[PDB]
Amino acid sequence: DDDNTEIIKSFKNFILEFRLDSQFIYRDQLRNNILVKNYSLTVNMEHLIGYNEDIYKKLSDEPSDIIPLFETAITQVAKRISILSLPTFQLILNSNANQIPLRDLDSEHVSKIVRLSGIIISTSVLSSRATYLSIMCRNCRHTTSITINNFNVSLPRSCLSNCGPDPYIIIHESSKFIDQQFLKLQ
Amino acid sequence: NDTNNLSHQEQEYLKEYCDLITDLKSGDLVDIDLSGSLVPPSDVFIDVRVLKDAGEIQTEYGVFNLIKDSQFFVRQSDVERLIQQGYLQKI
Amino acid sequence: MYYGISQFSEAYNKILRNSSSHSSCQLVIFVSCLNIDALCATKMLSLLFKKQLVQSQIVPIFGYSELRRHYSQLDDNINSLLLVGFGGVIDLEAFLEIDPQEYVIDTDEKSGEQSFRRDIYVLDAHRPWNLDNIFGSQIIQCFDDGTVDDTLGEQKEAYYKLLELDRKQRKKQIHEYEGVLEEYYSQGTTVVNSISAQIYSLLSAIGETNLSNLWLNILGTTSLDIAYAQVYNRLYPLLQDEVKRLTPSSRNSVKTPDTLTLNIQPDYYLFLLRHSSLYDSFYYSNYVNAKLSLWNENGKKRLHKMFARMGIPLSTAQETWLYMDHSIKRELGIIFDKNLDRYGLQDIIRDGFVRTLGYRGSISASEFVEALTALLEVGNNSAQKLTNLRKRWVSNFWLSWDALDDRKVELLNRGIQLAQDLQRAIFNTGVAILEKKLIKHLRIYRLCVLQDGPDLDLYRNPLTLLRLGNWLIECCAESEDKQLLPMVLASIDENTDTYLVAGLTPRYPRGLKKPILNNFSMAFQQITAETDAKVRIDNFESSIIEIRREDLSPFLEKLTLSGLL
Amino acid sequence: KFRYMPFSPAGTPFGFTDRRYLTMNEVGYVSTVKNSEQYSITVSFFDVGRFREYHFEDLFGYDLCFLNEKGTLFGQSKTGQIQYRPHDSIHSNWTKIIPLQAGERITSVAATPVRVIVGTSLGYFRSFNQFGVPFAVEKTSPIVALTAQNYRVFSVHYSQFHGLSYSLSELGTSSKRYYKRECPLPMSLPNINSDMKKDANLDYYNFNPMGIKSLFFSSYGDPCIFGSDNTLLLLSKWRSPEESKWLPILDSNMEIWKMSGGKETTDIHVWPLALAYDTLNCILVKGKHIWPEFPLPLPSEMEIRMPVFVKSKLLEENKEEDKEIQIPVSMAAEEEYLRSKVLSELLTDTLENDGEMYGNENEVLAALNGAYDKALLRLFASACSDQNVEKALSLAHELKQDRALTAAVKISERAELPSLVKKINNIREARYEQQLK
Amino acid sequence: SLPAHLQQTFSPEEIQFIVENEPIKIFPRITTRQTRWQLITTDDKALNNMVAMRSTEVVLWIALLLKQQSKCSIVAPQWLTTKELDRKIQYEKTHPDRFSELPWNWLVLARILFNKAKDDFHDPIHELRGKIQDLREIRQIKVLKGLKYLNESHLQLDNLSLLEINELRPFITEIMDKLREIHTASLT
Ligand SMILES: [Zn+2]
């Protein structure tokens, strides 16, 4: 339970303190992005490694679990530098690690950060995914909500307020969504 | 205080205005260089590197030998005009 | 004139007094380009005089040809001039048209000391000196490591007695002193000490010591380790004391974006370890190639075999060293203790200096000097082309100079990127020389000549040629136990139709007692004095010469016929 | 229990480290670092214009050091080895080794422009000229501290069997003169706190078992010392033995208490350096260890003030959270009048005997007299407002200038005290007659 | 005649020049008290009567000129300390419209002293550099709220620094002028 708070605290203190010479480059970037209504941050791996190698080690071992924690840390900083409401911010990464040729990817690489290159050959249309979502309970007519995030979920079955075996339905009239797209790399 | 694009009335106008500027710059108030720099003086001493081979030249403070890609440690109040003319860089 | 360590302060006081006036540029520095130690020294001096508000000019110089030109044009109110990194071996009063009577201001009636309107100061550890410079030449003022006073009694005596002397007794005496001086002259070159080191002692004397100065000291010193290992080894302990002295209290505190540190820790004779990859660090190391014969597959397979036994997966050994896994990074210091012995490769382990500033990551002095050197080499009818080339090489001085500043790390990274390509191109020529067996094994010395190559232009610069020579010398030093021989290396140019020639010494292996001396100087000199051939001698390092295409073979024929080799 | 140890003015222990300060004064300070079996020493100056900072190596492990603006003196307490170094190059340094009995050790050393002095645990005193020629040997109480300023020298001595004591002397080249010889010293001891508290500062008491934090002569040659209670003491009227007396002139703890808003910031410590007229030069040290470290932090300046206040009363008077406590005007005026009086007397004694150094100090004395009457007028007016004619009249005697007495008449008129107007004018007439005489 | 970028405003160089004329407290390492300085735009007595390690007050440009060399040390202003900056941040958070009462030159002086005099502070410099940033960010929030009250008549500002005003000058004055033109045109 406490580990989720220590990790968030660590990335929060990263953004608030990384100077190179005399400019707090991530505080300035995060402020300048909000003014043009861009809710994201472009972190660079080499700076993270320079600041504290342990954080990069945690990120390198379990990326599916740790990327959401760093994203919520960005939101917590974004409020302090601009409010005396905002969505959850998108984390974006840059790296210079060795490229893997696309033909060499195999079972040794599952759930690892990978850098590669190629040619885009196809693009899908946009489609909608849910982030904040509201729920109605069919029997008692009680209501609640859930927060999805898009890393590797289904509707729950613990009924509340007997209340039945599978009583939950979605209120699309009070829920939030985001864009998603598919691509093919050759 | 080159000419082909100016109309002839403009060609004499420019000469007239140059005469006026040098008249103001001369006489009383001569102690302040009205055509000099407008940026406040930051430092007395600077390091300047030699960009063009103008050879040996004279200036009110003294004589310089502009050996290409040599470097000077000198007071700015002297070399300000040579920086403006483009023989020197501040590095 | 010469001064001792106990009297450097006095020259400094004299200079401050003599170059006082603000009306004129009363102080001039002449510095040899294409030398690192000279560069660093000059840097140090510049900072000192900066603090002292001494108006001055810095001029880089290529060689003797340029030296005369630059000296010629000097104004009379130039009360003081410094010669950095050259000149100790030659009579300066002979080299220039010096009449002392054109420069004495005042003769001190009491001392007999003549005060001159233009004073010339010299810094160089090349030996032996031209004796007049020490003894006769009053305007000339050079610094010595007590070497002159300690050694030269018979020679000093010989010089003065020979000068004073100007029938059986007279004949015997003259013959005697002729002998003495003849014995002293014409001995192989050697270079005994670091320029920057001497200046650091002066800074010590004044009280100007700081980490910015000490790091320059280390940098300058470090440049010697490749070629004059003995020197480096003599100097080294002093550096440890200084680093331990000036490092602050409360050590091993938490980082800050402002925290700077300098510390002693392991370093490896591996080519740029903390950049590129671990595998490339071994593969391009100048020492490893001599120890495992990497020019052929029976050598390369030994390297693969080593990493397999060390327990490092070969696909991770090729990853960029910054991104390589943390566990391997911290276990590497123990893995080498268990495995290098089986490959006869234990000499890889040593201690060195590492510096870091804030959050931007560590670098060692050994890596820094390679970056500097690379920037020197590759930074961006016949007489005009020569002129253009020589002028281009001087701009790289400033492209190097500006990289000594912590505010300009951007330029240093470019230097490192160039260093990697230079070593790659050197290795790809060395393998061709060995596999085609272009080394000719003459009885007295080893000869090698490059008639063609993938791009032979890279060897037109002296420094690059020296790097290739240094590669071949390690290979020749380890390939057989027998026959430590001199080596000659040459490269043609299609624009001049001239061969650029270098004469190279042997050397003893790293792990093993007087030093040897480079004798090519006298040899080259004597054949040049004799020969019909069209040749050039103007370089500070006399071991390097140039000659036209058709004249190489008669020159080398006369050279091998000579007994001076 | 007590044990003898070496000392030098305001040194530091090694602590956990391989380096320390040997001593400090107004001119500069000395530091050293240990390098396996050898030591490196560094000498620093605040007058960077006048002097050059320098360094050298010691193989012998000196543990004693003394500085003046002519040179530096170094010693080894166990081996008896000593060395003196002039600041100039011209007079080359010289060394000597001094005899010692079994278990005897040197406790302190000091030097004038022409005299060299050494003291030991067994109470032996030895003296030499600036070229090591011996002059005399004497047997006294064991010495624990020494200091000098030109020809004036100030010494401290302690024994189980003779108590704590001090001496004052002047090594005039015309003649040597003693003003006090091992007379009793009223200094506050630290032993009770060291025996009871177990504060983990025991290393400092091992390093300095006397707990005498520092001692030096003023900028006008007055003898001064800083106690283990963190109080500054000065010896007044030393020229007159029936009038000589010790004066407490500043309590550091009381200042930090007020500065903190009446709070107990025991994490803060004061390290004294030198006394410049009315102002202390000092380092403000924070954290575990009550002494400074490297690189040297910048100094601070602080004025002396008389001990008159009370914490509880000032808290009651006072009653943003750290705001320094507000004080009654009566206390402020009283403290000023006492401080003005003491300062004027000390300055007067200095001028009476040694004259002006610079040609303007009389003007400061005039300013002090003005401040003195001004403070008394405020106190007088308070007494008049209270209608205490007796106390107001007693205060009026202490005013100097008739300007102030005229103001006192106006104050009495505002107080509507014609009796006091009358009696002040009687005093003014009497003092005018005394001025006419 | 005059450059286009100097028609209505001061450049940051001129702002630095203006700030440099203020007095500052120093400790000299040499004694000048018994040539003499003979200045014409300032007092001359203080520099002629210096005594080593005796505190004195001089103009800032001469103070930086001395600190260039060994001869001087600069005392930091009392507001430039961790305790005071903590209190000012708390004031800023407590009063969501008022500006805290920092001196008119706080940004300029902080960014001069951190470069020229990094060695003479008592607090650790890497904390001061953080607290200065916190103050500037909070003040920028308060500025962005205020630009919704540009009007035809006037505005009041308090404790806003010189550099902060100069940053905003060409925007506020221009938009306010055009609102004035639109309004008065309807009256006429
Ligand atoms: Zn329910």
Core attributes:
part of a larger assembly, 5 chains, B: 91 residues, alpha+beta, three-stranded antiparallel β-sheet, two-stranded antiparallel ribbon, 5 strands, 26% strand, D: 437 residues, 9 helices, 27% helix, binds zinc ion, DNA replication complex GINS protein PSF1 (chain B)
Strands, helices and their partners?
This is part of a larger assembly, with chains A (186 residues), B (91 residues), C (565 residues), D (437 residues) and E (188 residues).
Chain A: H1 3-17, H2 25-35, E1 40-44, H3 45-51, H4 53-61, H5 63-80, E2 90-94, E3 120-123, E4 127-130, E5 132-137, E6 143-147, E7 168-170, E8 177-180, E9 183-185
Parallel strand pairs in A: 1-2
Antiparallel strand pairs in A: 3-9, 4-8, 5-6, 5-7
Chain C: E1 2-3, H1 8-18, E2 27-32, H2 36-51, E3 56-61, H3 64-72, E4 80-84, H4 92-95, E5 104-107, E6 114-116, E7 119-123, E8 126-127, H5 131-135, E9 140-143, H6 147-151, H7 153-165, H8 168-184, E10 190-191, H9 195-206, H10 211-222, H11 229-246, E11 260-267, H12 278-283, H13 286-292, H14 297-310, H15 314-317, H16 326-339, E12 350-357, E13 363-364, H17 365-378, H18 382-401, H19 409-435, E14 440-441, E15 446-450, H20 462-479, E16 487-493, E17 498-504, H21 520-530, E18 535-536, E19 544-548, H22 552-561
Parallel strand pairs in C: 1-9, 2-3, 2-4, 4-7, 7-9, 15-16
Antiparallel strand pairs in C: 5-6, 8-10, 11-12, 12-13, 14-15, 16-17, 17-19, 18-19
Helix pairs in contact in C: 2-9, 2-10, 7-8, 9-10, 10-11, 13-20, 17-18, 17-19, 19-20
Chain E: H1 12-19, E1 23-28, H2 45-48, E2 56-59, H3 60-67, E3 72-74, H4 82-94, H5 106-116, H6 125-146, H7 162-187
Antiparallel strand pairs in E: 1-2, 1-3
The structure holds zinc ion.
Subcellular location (chain D): Nucleus
Protein name (chain D): DNA polymerase alpha-binding protein
WD repeats (chain D): 227-267
